[PDB]
């Protein structure tokens, strides 16, 4: 993994993920992103390497099973995704590619209804 936070002791990202509330015990370990509305990341190009696949992935939960979320990446494309949480953690993965290194920024956004639960978010490269 390139960039990851638990929500706990560890944020290697580049750039603050807005709207972060950590003041629960509620993560796959310690704490959890409680997410009400909006999460939102910009990871500069300088951060990332031109011309690569990477993953996006994350553990997500409701306990009362009635929200879902939408992620959005804008990265050489700007693809949308519905992501619906399970009583319980599990792992979700999407995909995104970057082009040339120049100075605009990569996009993560998961917005979600009503609330639901966040941990272990990473960035990771492929090939
Ligand atoms: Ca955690």
Do not use: C, H
Request: hydrophobic letters at 25%; a negative charge; charged letters at 25%.
């Amino acid at each position: 993994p390139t960039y990851f936070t638990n929500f706990d002791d560890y944020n290697n990202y580049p750039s603050t993920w807005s709207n972060v509330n950590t003041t629960n015990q509620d993560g796959l370990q310690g704490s959890a992103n409680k997410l009400n509305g909006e999460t939102k990341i910009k990871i500069p190009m300088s951060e990332l390497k031109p011309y690569k696949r990477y993953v996006f992935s994350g553990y997500s939960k409701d306990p009362l099973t009635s929200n879902s979320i939408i992620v959005k990446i804008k990265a050489k494309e700007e693809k949308t995704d519905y992501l619906v949480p399970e009583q319980g953690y599990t792992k979700f993965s999407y995909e995104f590619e970057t082009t040339e290194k120049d100075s605009s920024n990569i996009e993560i956004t998961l917005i979600g209804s009503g609330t639901t639960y966040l941990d272990n978010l990473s960035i990771t490269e492929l090939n």
